[PDB]
């Protein structure tokens, strides 16, 4: 019973972190990359997503 709460906590945190590296419709999944490749007027379009 003690191990299961730890496992669910760890799985929640790991899923949270894994969700970071994922395009949500954006051209890229790294904020740095989108800024480098796009001017702010069309950068905000991806950053909002």
């Amino acid at each position: 019973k003690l191990q299961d709460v730890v496992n669910q906590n760890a799985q929640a945190l790991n899923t949270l972190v894994k969700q970071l590296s994922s395009n949500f419709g954006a051209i890229s999944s790294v904020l740095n990359d989108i800024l480098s490749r796009l001017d702010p007027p069309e950068a905000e379009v991806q950053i909002d997503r």
Binding site: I27, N32, D33, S36, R37, L38, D39
Partner: protein
């Protein structure tokens, strides 16, 4: 044309000429100097001024339908300038031709060369019958032509961004390496902050 292992400066090409149609879709035109792209491709052709707009992702037109379909995910710039003075002539320039019709649509970034009369049926046609019509057609190019009918020369630069280590890097100055300090870094386009 594949372009590799060379320092590429956007500024010289931008100061060189006021291009008729200059737009970068997946890239910022100004930020080209900062970033590195691997294996840039250059595609060259000549189309009438009306055709220039058709060169775009997710856009349909006779040239797009049969001649040049850009990828919808295409990342790079398109540069186009007027070329009436050197190409067009009074008698008529018919060297530059286009595939008016074709049995199907070409895939993105593909070249079609077949020179056989087209059939709307798609089955073989005899040239005398109305089924056969020549796909390969040319615009009558004249000096007196309107700017839309006047020839335009278009070069499309496609950059493969971050696929692999980038052989093509813009002109920037490397600096000395600093350790144990939380600093900015740009390793061949890998911009970031850290120690």
């Amino acid at each position: 044309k594949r372009i590799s292992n060379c320092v590429a400066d956007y500024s010289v090409l931008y100061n060189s000429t006021s291009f008729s149609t200059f737009k970068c879709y997946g890239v910022s035109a100004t930020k080209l100097n900062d970033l590195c792209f691997s294996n840039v491709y250059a595609d060259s052709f000549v189309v009438k001024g009306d055709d220039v707009r058709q060169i775009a992702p997710g856009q349909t037109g006779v040239i797009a339908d049969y001649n040049y379909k850009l990828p919808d995910d295409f990342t790079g710039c398109v540069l186009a300038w007027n070329t009436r003075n050197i190409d067009a002539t009074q008698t008529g320039n018919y060297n530059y031709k286009y595939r008016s019709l074709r049995h199907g649509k070409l895939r993105p970034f593909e070249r079609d060369i077949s020179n056989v009369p087209f059939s709307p049926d798609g089955k073989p046609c005899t040239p005398p019958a109305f089924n056969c019509y020549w796909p390969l057609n040319d615009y009558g190019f004249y000096i007196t032509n309107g700017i839309g009918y006047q020839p335009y020369r278009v070069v499309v630069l496609s950059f493969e961004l971050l696929n692999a280590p980038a052989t093509v890097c813009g002109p920037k100055l490397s600096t000395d390496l600093i350790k144990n300090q939380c600093v900015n870094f740009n390793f061949n386009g890998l911009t970031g902050t850290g120690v």
